[PDB]
Amino acid sequence: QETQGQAAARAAAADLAAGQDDEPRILEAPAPDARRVYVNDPAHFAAVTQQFVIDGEAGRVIGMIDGGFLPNPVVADDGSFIAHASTVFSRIARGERTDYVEVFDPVTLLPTADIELPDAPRFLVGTYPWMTSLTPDGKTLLFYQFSPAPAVGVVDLEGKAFKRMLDVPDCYHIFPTAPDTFFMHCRDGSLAKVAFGTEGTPEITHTEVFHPEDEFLINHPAYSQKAGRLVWPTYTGKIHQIDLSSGDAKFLPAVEALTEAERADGWRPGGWQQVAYHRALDRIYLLVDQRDEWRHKTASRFVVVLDAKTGERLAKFEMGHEIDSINVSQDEKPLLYALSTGDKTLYIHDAESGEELRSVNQLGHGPQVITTADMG
Amino acid sequence: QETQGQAAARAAAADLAAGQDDEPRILEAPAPDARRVYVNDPAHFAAVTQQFVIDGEAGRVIGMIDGGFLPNPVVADDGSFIAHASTVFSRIARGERTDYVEVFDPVTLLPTADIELPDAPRFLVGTYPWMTSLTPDGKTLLFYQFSPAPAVGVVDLEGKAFKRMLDVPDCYHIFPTAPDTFFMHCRDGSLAKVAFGTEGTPEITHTEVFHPEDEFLINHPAYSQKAGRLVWPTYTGKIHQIDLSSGDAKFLPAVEALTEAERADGWRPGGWQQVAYHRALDRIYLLVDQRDEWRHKTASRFVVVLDAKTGERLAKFEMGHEIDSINVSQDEKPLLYALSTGDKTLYIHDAESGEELRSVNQLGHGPQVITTADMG
Amino acid sequence: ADDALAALGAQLFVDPALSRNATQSCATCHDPARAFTDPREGKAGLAVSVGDDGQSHGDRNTPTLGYAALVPAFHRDANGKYKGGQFWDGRADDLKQQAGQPMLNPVEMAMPDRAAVAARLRDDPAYRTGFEALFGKGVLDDPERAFDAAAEALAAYQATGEFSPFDSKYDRVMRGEEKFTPLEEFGYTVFITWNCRLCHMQRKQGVAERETFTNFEYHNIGLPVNETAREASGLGADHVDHGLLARPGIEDPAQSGRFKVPSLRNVAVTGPYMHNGVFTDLRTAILFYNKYTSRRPEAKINPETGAPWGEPEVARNLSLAELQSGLMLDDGRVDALVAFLETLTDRRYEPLLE
Amino acid sequence: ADDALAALGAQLFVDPALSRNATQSCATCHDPARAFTDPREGKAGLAVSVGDDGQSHGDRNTPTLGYAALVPAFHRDANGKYKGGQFWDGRADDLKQQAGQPMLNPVEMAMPDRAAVAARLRDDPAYRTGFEALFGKGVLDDPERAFDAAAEALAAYQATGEFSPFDSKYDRVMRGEEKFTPLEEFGYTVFITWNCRLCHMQRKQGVAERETFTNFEYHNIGLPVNETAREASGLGADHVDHGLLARPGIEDPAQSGRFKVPSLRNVAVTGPYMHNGVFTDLRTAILFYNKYTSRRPEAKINPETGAPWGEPEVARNLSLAELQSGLMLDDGRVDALVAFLETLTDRRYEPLLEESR
Amino acid sequence: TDPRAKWVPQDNDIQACDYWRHCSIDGNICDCSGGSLTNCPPGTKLATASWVASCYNPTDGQSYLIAYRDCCGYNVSGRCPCLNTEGELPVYRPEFANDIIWCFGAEDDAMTYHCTISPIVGKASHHHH
Amino acid sequence: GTDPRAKWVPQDNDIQACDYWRHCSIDGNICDCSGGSLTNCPPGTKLATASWVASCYNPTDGQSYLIAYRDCCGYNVSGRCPCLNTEGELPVYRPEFANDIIWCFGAEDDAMTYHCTISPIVGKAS
Numbered sequence A, B: 001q002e003t004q005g006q007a008a009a010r011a012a013a014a015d016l017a018a019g020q021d022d023e024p025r026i027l028e029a030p031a032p033d034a035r036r037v038y039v040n041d042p043a044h045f046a047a048v049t050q051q052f053v054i055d056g057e058a059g060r061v062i063g064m065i066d067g068g069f070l071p072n073p074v075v076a077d078d079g080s081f082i083a084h085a086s087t088v089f090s091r092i093a094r095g096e097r098t099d100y101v102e103v104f105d106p107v108t109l110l111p112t113a114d115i116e117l118p119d120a121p122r123f124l125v126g127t128y129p130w131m132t133s134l135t136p137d138g139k140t141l142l143f144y145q146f147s148p149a150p151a152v153g154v155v156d157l158e159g160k161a162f163k164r165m166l167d168v169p170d171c172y173h174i175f176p177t178a179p180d181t182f183f184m185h186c187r188d189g190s191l192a193k194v195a196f197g198t199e200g201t202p203e204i205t206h207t208e209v210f211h212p213e214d215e216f217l218i219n220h221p222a223y224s225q226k227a228g229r230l231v232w233p234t235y236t237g238k239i240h241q242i243d244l245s246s247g248d249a250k251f252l253p254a255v256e257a258l259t260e261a262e263r264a265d266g267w268r269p270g271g272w273q274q275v276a277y278h279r280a281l282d283r284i285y286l287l288v289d290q291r292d293e294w295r296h297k298t299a300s301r302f303v304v305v306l307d308a309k310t311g312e313r314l315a316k317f318e319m320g321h322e323i324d325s326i327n328v329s330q331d332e333k334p335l336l337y338a339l340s341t342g343d344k345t346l347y348i349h350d351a352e353s354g355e356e357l358r359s360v361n362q363l364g365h366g367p368q369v370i371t372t373a374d375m376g
Numbered sequence C: 001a002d003d004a005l006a007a008l009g010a011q012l013f014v015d016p017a018l019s020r021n022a023t024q025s026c027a028t029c030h031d032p033a034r035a036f037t038d039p040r041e042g043k044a045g046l047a048v049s050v051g052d053d054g055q056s057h058g059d060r061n062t063p064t065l066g067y068a069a070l071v072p073a074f075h076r077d078a079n080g081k082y083k084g085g086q087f088w089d090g091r092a093d094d095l096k097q098q099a100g101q102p103m104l105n106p107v108e109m110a111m112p113d114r115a116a117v118a119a120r121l122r123d124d125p126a127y128r129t130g131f132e133a134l135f136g137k138g139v140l141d142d143p144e145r146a147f148d149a150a151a152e153a154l155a156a157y158q159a160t161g162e163f164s165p166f167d168s169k170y171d172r173v174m175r176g177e178e179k180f181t182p183l184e185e186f187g188y189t190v191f192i193t194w195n196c197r198l199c200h201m202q203r204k205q206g207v208a209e210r211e212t213f214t215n216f217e218y219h220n221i222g223l224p225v226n227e228t229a230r231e232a233s234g235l236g237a238d239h240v241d242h243g244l245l246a247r248p249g250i251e252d253p254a255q256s257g258r259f260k261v262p263s264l265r266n267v268a269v270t271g272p273y274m275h276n277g278v279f280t281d282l283r284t285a286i287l288f289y290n291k292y293t294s295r296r297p298e299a300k301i302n303p304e305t306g307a308p309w310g311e312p313e314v315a316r317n318l319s320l321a322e323l324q325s326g327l328m329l330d331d332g333r334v335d336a337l338v339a340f341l342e343t344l345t346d347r348r349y350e351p352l353l354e
Numbered sequence D: 001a002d003d004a005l006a007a008l009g010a011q012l013f014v015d016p017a018l019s020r021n022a023t024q025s026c027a028t029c030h031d032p033a034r035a036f037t038d039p040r041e042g043k044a045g046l047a048v049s050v051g052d053d054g055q056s057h058g059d060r061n062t063p064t065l066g067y068a069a070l071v072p073a074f075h076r077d078a079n080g081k082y083k084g085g086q087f088w089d090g091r092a093d094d095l096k097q098q099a100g101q102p103m104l105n106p107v108e109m110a111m112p113d114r115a116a117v118a119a120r121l122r123d124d125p126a127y128r129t130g131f132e133a134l135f136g137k138g139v140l141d142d143p144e145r146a147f148d149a150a151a152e153a154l155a156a157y158q159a160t161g162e163f164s165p166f167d168s169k170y171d172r173v174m175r176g177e178e179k180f181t182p183l184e185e186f187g188y189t190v191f192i193t194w195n196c197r198l199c200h201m202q203r204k205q206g207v208a209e210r211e212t213f214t215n216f217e218y219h220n221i222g223l224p225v226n227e228t229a230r231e232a233s234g235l236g237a238d239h240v241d242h243g244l245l246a247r248p249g250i251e252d253p254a255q256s257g258r259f260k261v262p263s264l265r266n267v268a269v270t271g272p273y274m275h276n277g278v279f280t281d282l283r284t285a286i287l288f289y290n291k292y293t294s295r296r297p298e299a300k301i302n303p304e305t306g307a308p309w310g311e312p313e314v315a316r317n318l319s320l321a322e323l324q325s326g327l328m329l330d331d332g333r334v335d336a337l338v339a340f341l342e343t344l345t346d347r348r349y350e351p352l353l354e355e356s357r
Numbered sequence E: 001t002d003p004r005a006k007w008v009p010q011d012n013d014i015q016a017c018d019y020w021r022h023c024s025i026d027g028n029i030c031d032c033s034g035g036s037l038t039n040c041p042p043g044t045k046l047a048t049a050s051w052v053a054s055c056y057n058p059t060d061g062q063s064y065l066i067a068y069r070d071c072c073g074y075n076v077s078g079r080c081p082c083l084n085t086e087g088e089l090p091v092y093r094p095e096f097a098n099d100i101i102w103c104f105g106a107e108d109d110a111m112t113y114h115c116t117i118s119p120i121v122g123k124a125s126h127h128h129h
Numbered sequence F: 001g002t003d004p005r006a007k008w009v010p011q012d013n014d015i016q017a018c019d020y021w022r023h024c025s026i027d028g029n030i031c032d033c034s035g036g037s038l039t040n041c042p043p044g045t046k047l048a049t050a051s052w053v054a055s056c057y058n059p060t061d062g063q064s065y066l067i068a069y070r071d072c073c074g075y076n077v078s079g080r081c082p083c084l085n086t087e088g089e090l091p092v093y094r095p096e097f098a099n100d101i102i103w104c105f106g107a108e109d110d111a112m113t114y115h116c117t118i119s120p121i122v123g124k125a126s
Ligand code: HEC
Pocket: C013, C024, C025, C026, C027, C028, C029, C030, C049, C050, C051, C052, C058, C060, C061, C062, C063, C064, C065, C068, C085, C086, C087, C088, C089, C095, C098, C099, C100, C102, C103, C107, C108, C109, C154
């Protein structure tokens, strides 16, 4: 009913009338919680970018963090910190490149570490959450490098130093499962398990091939570290689910996000973060719309919600806006976050009914990535 | 009426059809000329910004130059280089500040000098073209400092080095008249003449106070180095003209840009660059509209053109868009450039008839400043 | 009632029978003709005052008593800043606890004890009547009750409208009764947009009902020793005035060198300035703040000496965050500030501005 | 006329009577059964060829004549980049200028002079008949005329469809007659998106009508001396092959160490590789490029020797801007390129591919 | 929504550009990026410098001095941008000028502009306004 | 207007529009809009040597061409004529067809910031 700006005007008016004093100062953001959500704005490849720290419950911006060129945000699941790997240049977009990792306090937002990465080793790509990743103990950050070859950089957040680059096969993305282990998806259609020490050749093991060369796995799979569930849609809304919770890859039965008549009538996923996974509900959310097959990065206006075990459809919400990315809060009665890069607005929906509840607009230039902590 | 992109599709199809090869390469901008126009985007106080180099004749972007926080562009009137004083930080908007001057080659857009300014001495302010200025010989760049006190920094572009700060009194803006002299406008209503040798206090002498404490002179006067004409509108469209062409300040007759009637019906100048001056035509252009007295920075929809010698109005144009800034080319049959911050679009008009000819859209986020070289 | 009490304090305030040799009253040092400060020329000029014995000088400048009754009782606020109290170092809680101290101070009024004070009170028939009517029969026979009642009367006398009339030009202008001159309003605008309002305004924001141009806090602004005054005080060239840290109970090292933000009311007529009277001119006091902001050679030099200011007497806990504002006050703004400060003069002291 | 001139060239091409001891014809070193390259073993393996005296070795590897007729005559474009010509260093202008040179090269066919060549042509009644019909009576009696006429015949013969048939799988695939294997298609895609296409495609952009996988420019890729071949040639431990700078008339020290980009047509069958025959295997020639891109220690090691590639014979004027692409070819991409390059084999040499694969 | 019209102060929503205290704000309202009406957002640094304006409060009919202070050391917030200029004077009257980045005194020498707060510092009272 | 989900329709009449046929797998900004041309970089920027390809149908001649996009690097994003097309675009693990990657490798001075992309033809489709 009453907006935040209206509630604020009323309270200031009342302080003025009461002669209430108060010191102008620097606010602390409220304690991180399950309804905190972070929206990162790669700003369509601009050299400097913004992340917005949002209270999902109030639909309120509670803070912001600056970053450089296509930074990779990560959010520790227990809420104790956030961090990103970022890239700056001495003369805006030109001159000496410095890649670095910053860790921030989640309440004051102040950097508590600034760790230089030797030899500008970050992969510059449109933001894929799983190209930079925290190990489950929060002590290490792993970042992907593409050039000169696929590699993974190991950064010690606790000791605040870069450790080493690991040579990997021709693989992509980084899904950590342990303090020293992560999975990558390879060009051959397998997953590679990479187990690394402080020094020495990583132990690299491939799974079986789990998809044909002509089924295409999207750049934004959902991964729940706490569930070890990797949820990987193909262009057609076919969903591969891989269970990494044993430490080794177990291939779950494939489900179809869309029915055969929908597929015959041109329904396909599309957007950026096309898929979200709610761990406690074991539920998959997929951004889908009617579209030609090579329009797979365009916004979608519908989310199908399906049971991850049976593949049964539970809902098909009509989002009512052009949505590129989705994610969910991981608490019960979760929120469904639906970010429009076009509208620069995060729409905050009730994940159960699909109802839009509120929204936060003016989130940068081309905001694309939603992150939440899984604190439960 | 064929657009540039259509003409380009046609030449490409023809090269393809004739089997004509060409080497993919870095283009050079067309030689600087009178119809080149630069649009600076301070980007509403963003930490990095852009300059657009535009061929005004063709209405085509022919190059761009990146800048840091609220940089001050300058353009050598002879077309032989451009430059800015800029400001970067080691972590986007935080950490160590570097102020510096870059000089750029005007066809390759490559930097030919990068001159550190010690102790971060730049005045950080919404962009006033005359807060940083080239001396007529192009060998020196002078920039304003506000903190701890009004001062002017002397930058040797020839030896590519900062020289020193000049103490000045409580004055503002920098209008160079000679290799060793510039004027400033003082709080007390006077102009200060500053003459610097290589050593010690400059010699500082004041004019007569030339306006009352309650007649407000705008932050964007027009100043033609080559004519020594300082054109200074006040808030009511009253225009001060100061002749600095003899080495000392002679005051021209004060002139009114709006009719005494018109001011009674709420006509006042408003915008950013509210005024332009064409040297060869001896002609003042002024952005005016009907507004409240304290809406002085809002867009205007009308330009009035008056003769500098007499004050005779020559034309009143209905711009057809919300204009914040104007300027003119300095050749014959000048263009009148009308930059809309809101539209991020430079509208290019015939300055004789005021008709719109062409326009260049997508000029960043909040473009504000138009600069042209006076090459004739 | 609250009236008779104050009228008793009025009598004690000008009575020299409260000094050992009966040569000085509170009014000797807090001269009502000089906004309750000391006119008397001494070994260190007007920097410190001379006690009842005719030779002992204090080590601190005698402050005005105008507006002292607006200062809250000493306390540490929820952000850990000490506020309020009386004396430059806040060592008295309030006016009541302060009043008995000059009486017993051997460097001031120098009564040997509460009893000798009670003896002098009994010698006067009019005090017998006045005290007895307010505190009851035999009050004066008991040195403790006599002394406490005298402090009480003085404190009440200091809380009357006479010490705090709010009739300065500034007050009249805030009532919309008059306007500031252009110079004065520039000074006001400067005073509240520049650092000064960080310390010399009652509140952080909103409007104070009875502004006294101090937030009641303690700040070390990095002042040197007053050479001649320190010499005259006899405290020794080794001595360090630790400001608030000298208050018993304050142990925090961060308070060393800190002094109570004085009220700027009547500042134009209660020179010399600072806790040790080191600067004779108001203009100098304002200029001292430029040592933290200005690059210019002149900023390092006390215009009164033509020599550098001096190292701070206490070189730590400087309030650098407030003092290093990044902006220098030019001559014009220093002029404007003097003009603004002069408007904080009570109506009755307007003639002293000359 | 056009038939006959080429037919006369076909005849000279296989004729050993054009060598001093009569042991050697063009076809001896440019063997049609091996895509016009030399199958013979010498003191440096197949790196360099042995002349008619049975002893003298050249300092460069004998190149294919296939598709050599597609190369433009030598010139400097407006880039100031030299293009075209014949020989690894471009020192012949075109096929015709080149053809007489083996004939008189004491290291190759070793005829003493043009007159000795003319006297050989006159000895054969079919040459008197063939030459005189195309060039007029008594042509063979004028040694300058006989020599120039033989060079023309031989240039014309190298211009026939026989030398450039364009009937490789690549061609058949570009005609829609077949498809690449998936390995091949990937090799093609790598070829055209990685740095190879900056030098091994005719055009900077657009589509070539007769692609021969070279832009005909000159680049120093920073190859080491081939030691055994250099010892066999006898040119000296201190000799430097300056490449294009050795062409007479070229003075620009920026041209030192630059060699003409070879057509990659038939590359699979015409090993060993590079201008001095330094690398035996096609894979090795591809791996050489990772030395400018890879951070792995193995990238600096020649897999044929297990030793560093070697200092460049000419350490300056390297094509670093092209070579240092910032991306390393992994093994999957190298196998993909081998497979692609093998599709560049003319139909008649596809059977040779067996003992490469 | 008519930008040239006299500005009509309101006292019912601080996030809107017509909120009575924003009468000479230039930039972004801090309350839109995690600050509040008179406090800076986390991570930013509060300047000690200000520019001041006398702003009419439609509610009590009184005029208040607003001493704007910048929150510095972050890139501009991008949220709730506003430029009003009631009583705003040119740069040579800097006390009333608002193109100036008023980040002086900010901790860590922070000088980049993120957003502005609008605290009241007095009643009064200007000649120009 | 213009359905973002509709099958893309190439045109060969305007290189500054996102449906221009060579832009079928472009991601970023057309260089022609910031001072480059269809196949050249703007002044001041550096031309990458890496590229992603696509097979783009040319409705002028009925042929499909291979377009090997190359970035112009070392400048902030131009912000003029943004476009994102994904005809045939494959995920990041098939990087020669993947267009989220900043294809700035090989650019002079190690430039890796993305300014805009050019659309030269490098082959016929097969
Ligand atoms: C000169 C010999 C004095 C006589 C007699 C009295 N006072 Fe005083 N006063 C004097 C000094 C030097 C100081 C400051 C001393 C210090 O250590 O800071 C004071 C201070 C006060 C104060 C505090 C005012 C404030 O902190 O702003 C009060 C309330 C005060 N004095 C009152 C007072 C009374 C009631 C007196 C007669 C009993 C009296 N003083 C005598 C100098 C002298």
